[PDB]
Paper text:
Accumulation of filamentous aggregates of tau protein in the brain is a pathological hallmark of Alzheimer’s disease (AD) and many other neurodegenerative tauopathies. The filaments adopt disease-specific cross-β amyloid conformations that self-propagate and are implicated in neuronal loss. Cryo–electron microscopy (Cryo-EM) of tau filaments purified from postmortem patient brains with different NDs has revealed that the amyloid core adopts different cross-β sheet structural conformations comprised of the tau microtubule-binding repeat. For example, AD filaments are comprised of 3 R and 4 R isoforms and adopt a C-shaped fold, while in Pick’s disease, 3 R tau forms an elongated J-shaped fold, and in corticobasal degeneration (CBD), 4 R tau adopts a four-layered β-strand arrangement.
Numbering used by the authors:
A (entry chain N), B (entry chain L), C (entry chain J), D (entry chain H), E (entry chain F), F (entry chain D), ...: 306 to 378
Write the structure that this text describes.
Amino acid sequence: VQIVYKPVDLSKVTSKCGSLGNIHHKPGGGQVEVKSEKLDFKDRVQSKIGSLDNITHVPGGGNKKIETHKLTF
Amino acid sequence: VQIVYKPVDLSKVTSKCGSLGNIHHKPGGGQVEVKSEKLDFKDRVQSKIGSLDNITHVPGGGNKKIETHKLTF
Amino acid sequence: VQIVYKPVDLSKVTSKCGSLGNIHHKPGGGQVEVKSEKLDFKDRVQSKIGSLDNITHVPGGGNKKIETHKLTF
Amino acid sequence: VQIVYKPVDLSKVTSKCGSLGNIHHKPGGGQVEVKSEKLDFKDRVQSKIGSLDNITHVPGGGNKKIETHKLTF
Amino acid sequence: VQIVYKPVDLSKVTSKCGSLGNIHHKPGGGQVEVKSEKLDFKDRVQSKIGSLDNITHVPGGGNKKIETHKLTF
Amino acid sequence: VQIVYKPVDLSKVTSKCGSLGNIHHKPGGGQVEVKSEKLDFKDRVQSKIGSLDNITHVPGGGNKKIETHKLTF
Amino acid sequence: VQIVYKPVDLSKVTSKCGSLGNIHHKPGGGQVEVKSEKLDFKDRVQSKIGSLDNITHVPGGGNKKIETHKLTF
Amino acid sequence: VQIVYKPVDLSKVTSKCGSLGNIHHKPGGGQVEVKSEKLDFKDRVQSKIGSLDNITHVPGGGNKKIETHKLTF
Amino acid sequence: VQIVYKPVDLSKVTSKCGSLGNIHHKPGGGQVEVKSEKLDFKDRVQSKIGSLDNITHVPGGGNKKIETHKLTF
Amino acid sequence: VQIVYKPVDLSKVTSKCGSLGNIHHKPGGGQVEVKSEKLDFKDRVQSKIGSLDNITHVPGGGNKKIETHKLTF
Amino acid sequence: VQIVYKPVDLSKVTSKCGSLGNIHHKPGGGQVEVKSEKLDFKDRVQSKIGSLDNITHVPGGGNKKIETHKLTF
Amino acid sequence: VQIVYKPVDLSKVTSKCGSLGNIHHKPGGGQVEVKSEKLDFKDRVQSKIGSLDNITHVPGGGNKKIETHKLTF
Amino acid sequence: VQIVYKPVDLSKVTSKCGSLGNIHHKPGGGQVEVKSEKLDFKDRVQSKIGSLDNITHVPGGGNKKIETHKLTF
Amino acid sequence: VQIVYKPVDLSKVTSKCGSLGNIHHKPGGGQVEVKSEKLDFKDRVQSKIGSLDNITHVPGGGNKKIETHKLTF
Amino acid sequence: VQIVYKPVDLSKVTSKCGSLGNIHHKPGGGQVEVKSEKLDFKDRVQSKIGSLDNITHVPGGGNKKIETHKLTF
Amino acid sequence: VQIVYKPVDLSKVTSKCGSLGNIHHKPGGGQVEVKSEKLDFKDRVQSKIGSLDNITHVPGGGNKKIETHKLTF
Amino acid sequence: VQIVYKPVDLSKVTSKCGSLGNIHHKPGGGQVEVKSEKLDFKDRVQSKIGSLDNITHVPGGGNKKIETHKLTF
Amino acid sequence: VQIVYKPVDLSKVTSKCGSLGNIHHKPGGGQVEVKSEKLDFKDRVQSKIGSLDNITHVPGGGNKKIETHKLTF
Amino acid sequence: VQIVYKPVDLSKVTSKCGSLGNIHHKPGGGQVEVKSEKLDFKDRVQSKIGSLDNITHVPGGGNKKIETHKLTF
Amino acid sequence: VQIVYKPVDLSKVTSKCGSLGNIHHKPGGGQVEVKSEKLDFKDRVQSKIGSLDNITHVPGGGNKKIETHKLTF
Amino acid sequence: VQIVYKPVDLSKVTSKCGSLGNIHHKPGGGQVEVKSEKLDFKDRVQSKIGSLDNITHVPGGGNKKIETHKLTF
Amino acid sequence: VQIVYKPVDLSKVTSKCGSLGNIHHKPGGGQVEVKSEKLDFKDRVQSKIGSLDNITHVPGGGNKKIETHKLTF
Amino acid sequence: VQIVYKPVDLSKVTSKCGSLGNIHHKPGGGQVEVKSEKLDFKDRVQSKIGSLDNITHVPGGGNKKIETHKLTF
Ligand SMILES: FCCC1CCN(c2ccn3c(n2)nc2ccccc23)CC1
Ligand SMILES: FCCC1CCN(c2ccn3c(n2)nc2ccccc23)CC1
Ligand SMILES: FCCC1CCN(c2ccn3c(n2)nc2ccccc23)CC1
Ligand SMILES: FCCC1CCN(c2ccn3c(n2)nc2ccccc23)CC1
Ligand SMILES: FCCC1CCN(c2ccn3c(n2)nc2ccccc23)CC1
Ligand SMILES: FCCC1CCN(c2ccn3c(n2)nc2ccccc23)CC1
Ligand SMILES: FCCC1CCN(c2ccn3c(n2)nc2ccccc23)CC1
Ligand SMILES: FCCC1CCN(c2ccn3c(n2)nc2ccccc23)CC1
Ligand SMILES: FCCC1CCN(c2ccn3c(n2)nc2ccccc23)CC1
Ligand SMILES: FCCC1CCN(c2ccn3c(n2)nc2ccccc23)CC1
Ligand SMILES: FCCC1CCN(c2ccn3c(n2)nc2ccccc23)CC1
Ligand SMILES: FCCC1CCN(c2ccn3c(n2)nc2ccccc23)CC1
Ligand SMILES: FCCC1CCN(c2ccn3c(n2)nc2ccccc23)CC1
Ligand SMILES: FCCC1CCN(c2ccn3c(n2)nc2ccccc23)CC1
Ligand SMILES: FCCC1CCN(c2ccn3c(n2)nc2ccccc23)CC1
Ligand SMILES: FCCC1CCN(c2ccn3c(n2)nc2ccccc23)CC1
């Protein structure tokens, strides 16, 4: 039995910008209320219970390249 | 038995912009109310219970290239 | 038995823009109410129970290229 | 037995724009009410129970190219 | 037995625009009410129970090219 | 036995526009009420129970090209 | 046995427009009421129970080209 | 039995920007309230119960390249 | 039995920027309240109960390259 | 039995910036209150109960390269 | 049985910056209150109960390269 | 000259009801448009130009008694 | 000259009700548009230009008694 | 000359109710637009230009008694 | 000349209620827009230009008694 | 000349209630926009330009008695 | 000339209530925008330009008695 | 000439209540924006330009008695 | 000439309450922005330009009695 | 000429309360911004420009009695 | 000429309370920004420019009695 | 000419309280910024420019009695 | 000419309290910044420029009685 695995990749994820500019993020605070009694979490459970979050993500150049090579017998 | 795997990729995910400009995000805070009794989470469960979230994602250049190579016997 | 797998790809996902401009996002906060008793989640379940979320996604250049190569015996 | 797999692709998903312009998103907050008793989720179930969400997606250049190569024996 | 698979593709999904212009989205918040007792979800079920959502998708250049190559024995 | 599969495609899905213009979307919020008791969903069921949604999709250049190549033995 | 499959396609789905213009969408919110008791969904069933939705789809250039190549033995 | 695994990658995730500009993040503090009785967490569970968080992520140049090579016998 | 594992990688995750600029982060302090009785955490559980956190991450040049090589017998 | 493991990597995670600029972080102190009775932590549990934290991370040049080589018999 | 393990790495995590600039961090002191009764910690548990912490991390040049080589029999 | 004015009134405007009951008012929002150029109002003029009004007047007991006594010389 | 004015009134405007009941007012928001150029109001003029108003007046007991006594020489 | 003015009034505007009940007012927000150029108001003019108002007046006991005594020479 | 003015009033504006009950006022926020150029107000003019107001007036016992005694020579 | 002014008043504006009850006021925030150029106000003019106001007036016992005695020569 | 002014008043504005109850006021924050150029106010002018105000007036016992005695020669 | 002024008043503005109860006021912060150029105020002008105010006035016993005695020659 | 002024007043503004109760005021901080150029105030002008104020006025017993006696020659 | 001024007042502004109770005032800090150029104040002008103020006025017994006696020749 | 001025006052502004109770004032610090150029104040002008003030006024017994006696010739 | 001025006052501003109780004032420090250029103050002008002040005024017994006697010729 | 001035006052401003109790004042330090260039103060001007002050005024018995007697010729 013979196996060959030679994937070739040559990619350019380019990102050119002159100038983003004046970005404003002025949220008004709200109100959040959560009421529970019992929590039982197991086996890779990620939770977010009760949140008032503000994020201003302004990256000059945003590029994500994902490659998942796999091989099984 | 013989196997060959030589996928060739040559791609340019280009992104050109002169200038984004004046971006404004001025939300007014609302109200959220959640009421529960029991929670039972298992086996890769991700939850978001109660949220008032504001996000201003302004990346100059947004490009995501996903490649999933697989091979099984 | 002989197998050959040589897919060739050469693609340019171009994106040219002069200037986005003045983008405004001024939402008025509403009201959300959720009432439950019992939750039982399992086996790759993602939930969003109760949310008042505002997002302003303004990426200069948006391009996503997905390739899923597979091969099984 | 002999197998050959040489798909050739050469595509340009072009996107040219001079300037988007003045985009405004001014929603008025409404009201949402959800009432349940029991939830039982399993086996790749994604839910959204109770939401008042506003999104302003303004990407300069929007282009998604999907290719799903498969081969089975 | 002999098999050959050489599909050739050469396509240009062009998109040219001078300027989008002044786009306005000013919805008035309504009211939504959902009342249930029991939920039982399984095996690739995605639900949206109770929503008041506003989206302003204004991408300069919108082009999606889908190719699904398959081959089975 | 011999098999040949060489489909050739060369297509240009062009889209030219000078300027979209002033687009306005000013809906008045209505009222929605849904009342149920039991839900039992299985095997690739996607539902939308209770919604008051407004969308303003204004892409400069809208072009989708779908190709589904298949081959079975 | 011999098989040949060489379909040739060369098509231009052109779309030229000078300027769309002033498009207005001003709906008045109505009222919707749905009343049920039991729901049992299975095997690729997609439902929309209770909706008051407004959409303003104004793409400069709308062109969709679908090709379904098939071959079976 | 023979196995070969020589994947070649040569990719440039470029990110060019002239100047980001004046970015402002002025959120108004809201209110969050969470009430529970018992918590039972196990086996890779990460939770966030009660949060009012503001983040201003402005990286000049944002590029993440992920490669997951795997091989099993 | 013979095994070879020679993956070659040559990638440049470049990030060029002229000058970020004047970045301001002026949040207004809110209020957070969490009330529980018993906590039982085990087996790789990370929690964040009660937080009012502000972060201004402004790295000139942000680039993360992840490679996970694996091999099992 | 023979095994070879010679992965070659040659990557440059470059980060060039002219000058970050005037970065300001002026948060207003909020209020946090957490109330519990009993805590029982075990087996790699990291918690953060009650926090009002401000961080201004401004590194000139941010680049993290992670490589996880593994091999098992 | 023979085993070879010769991974070669040659990477330059460069970070160039002209001058960071005037960075200001002027937080306003808030208030934090935590109330508990009993704590029981064991087996690699790190906790942070009650904190009002301010950090200004401004390193000229931030670059972390992690390599985890492993080999087991 | 002699004048006498002694009007005697003794009236009971009774209103008895056991229970009104379940009264529902669920109008569907219409559309109104008024276009004018000049308005000139004087000397006890009350106007209502442009209205979409809903009123649910349910008074338990409705009784109005009007008496206009007058006398002139 | 002699004048006498002795009007006697003895009236009971009674209103008895056991219980009003469940009154519901669920209007759907419409749309109103008014366009004018010049307004000139004088001398006891009350106007209402542009209104979308909902009122639910449910007074237990509604009784108004008006008496206008006058006398002139 | 002689004048006498002795009006006698003895009235009971009674209002009895057992219990109003469950009153609900759930309007859906509409849209109002008013456009003018010049306004000139004088001499006891009260105006309401542009309004979306909701009122729920539920007074237990509503009774207004008006008496206007006048006398002139 | 002789004048006498002895109006006698003896009135009981009674208001009895057992219990109002559960009153709910859940309006959905609409949208209001007013556009003018010049305003000239004089001589007892009260205006309300642009309003989205919600009022829930629930007074236990509502009774207003107005008496306007006048006398002139 | 002789003048007499002896108006006698003896009135009881009673208001009895057992218990108001559970009153809820949950409005959803809308949006208001007013645009003017010049304002000229004089001589007892009270204005309200631009308002989104919510009031919950629940006085146990509401009774206003107005008496305007006047006399002129 | 002789003048007499002896108005007698004996009034009881009573207000009895057992218990108001659970009153809730949970408004959702909206958005207000006012734009003007010049303001010229004189001679007893009170204005309110731009307001988002919430008031919960719950006085146990509300009674206002106004008497305006006047006399002129 | 003779003048007499002996107005007699004997009034009891009573207010009895057993217990107000649980009153809650949880508004969600909105957003207000006012833009002007010149202000010219004179001669008893009180203004409120730009306000987001919340008031919870809960006085046990609210009673205001106003008497304005006047006399002129 | 003779003048007499002997107004007699005997009034009891009573206020009785058993116990107010649990009053809560939990507003969510909004956002206010005011922009002007010139201010010119004179002659008894009181202004409030820019305010985000919260007040919880809970006086046990609220009673204000105003008497304005006047006399002129 | 003779003048007499003997106004008699005998009033009891009583205020009785058993116990106020648990009063809570937990506002969330918002954001205020005021921008002006020139201020010119004269002749009894009191201003408040820029304020984020919280007051909890809880006086046991609130009673203000104002009397303004005047007399002029 | 003769003048007499003998106003008699005998008033008891009583205030009785059993016990105020547990009063809490926990505001969250906001943010205030004021920007001006020139200030010119004269002739009894009191100003407050820029303030974030919290006051908890809890006086057991609050009673203010104001009397302004005046007399002029 | 004769003048008499004998105003008699006999008033008891009583204030009785059993015990105030547990009063807490826990504000969270905010942020204040004021920017000016020139200040010119004259003729009884009191100003407060820039303040973050907390006051807890809890006087057992608060009573202020003001009397302003005046007399002029 | 004769003048008499014999105002008699006999007032008791009483203040009785059993015990104030546990009063706590725990403010969190904020931040204040004031920036000016020139100050010119004259003629009874008192200013407070830049202050972060905390005061806990708890006087057992607070009573201020002000009397301003005046007389002029
Ligand atoms: F289960 C706990 C972890 C989950 C929930 C929290 N995360 C996110 C991530 C992104 N978004 C988001 N939430 N809400 C969003 C609203 C609009 C746009 C993007 C949004 C991470 C995943
Ligand atoms: F089942 C939970 C996940 C589902 C439901 C939520 N998602 C979406 C995505 C898109 N849209 C949407 N909802 N509503 C829409 C209305 C108009 C236009 C687009 C819309 C993701 C899929
Ligand atoms: F089952 C849960 C996931 C489903 C339902 C939600 N999604 C969508 C997507 C698009 N639209 C939509 N809903 N409603 C629409 C109305 C008009 C136009 C487009 C619309 C995603 C699929
Ligand atoms: F369990 C006790 C040890 C834990 C908790 C404390 N640590 C940290 C570390 C980083 N961050 C953080 N906390 N909070 C953050 C908020 C924003 C951004 C970064 C933040 C170390 C890990
Ligand atoms: F000119 C400005 C003042 C006018 C117009 C507004 N008012 C009203 C009052 C009552 N109704 C009404 N409008 N429309 C109605 C429709 C049905 C039933 C009753 C209605 C007060 C008087
Ligand atoms: F000119 C400015 C003042 C006018 C107009 C506004 N007012 C009102 C009052 C009552 N109603 C009303 N408008 N519209 C209504 C619709 C149905 C029922 C009652 C209604 C007060 C008078
Ligand atoms: F000109 C500025 C002052 C005017 C207009 C505003 N006021 C009101 C008062 C009452 N209502 C009202 N408006 N609209 C209403 C709709 C339905 C029912 C009652 C209504 C006070 C008078
Ligand atoms: F001109 C500036 C002063 C005017 C306008 C503002 N005021 C009010 C008062 C009462 N209402 C009202 N507006 N709108 C209303 C809608 C429904 C019911 C009652 C209403 C006070 C008078
Ligand atoms: F001109 C500046 C002063 C005016 C306007 C502000 N005031 C008010 C007072 C009462 N209300 C009101 N506005 N709007 C209202 C809506 C519904 C019910 C009552 C309302 C005081 C008078
Ligand atoms: F011109 C500057 C002074 C004016 C305006 C501010 N004041 C008020 C007073 C009361 N209310 C109000 N505004 N808005 C309100 C809304 C609903 C109910 C009551 C309301 C005092 C008078
Ligand atoms: F011109 C500067 C002085 C004016 C404006 C500020 N004042 C007030 C007073 C009371 N209220 C108010 N504003 N807004 C309110 C909203 C609802 C209820 C009551 C309200 C005092 C008078
Ligand atoms: F011009 C500078 C002096 C003026 C403005 C500041 N003052 C006040 C006083 C009372 N209130 C208020 N403002 N805003 C309020 C909102 C709701 C209720 C009461 C309110 C004192 C008078
Ligand atoms: F011009 C500088 C002096 C003025 C302004 C400052 N003062 C006040 C006084 C009282 N309040 C207030 N401001 N704001 C308030 C908000 C709600 C309730 C009461 C309020 C004193 C007078
Ligand atoms: F011009 C400089 C002197 C002025 C301003 C400062 N003073 C005050 C006094 C009282 N308050 C206040 N400010 N702000 C307040 C907010 C709520 C309640 C009461 C308040 C004294 C007068
Ligand atoms: F101009 C310089 C002298 C002025 C300003 C400083 N003083 C004060 C006095 C009282 N208060 C105050 N400031 N701010 C306050 C906030 C809330 C309550 C009371 C307050 C004395 C007068
Ligand atoms: F101009 C320099 C002298 C002035 C300013 C300083 N003084 C004060 C006095 C009292 N207070 C105050 N400042 N700030 C306060 C805040 C809250 C309550 C009371 C306060 C004395 C007068």
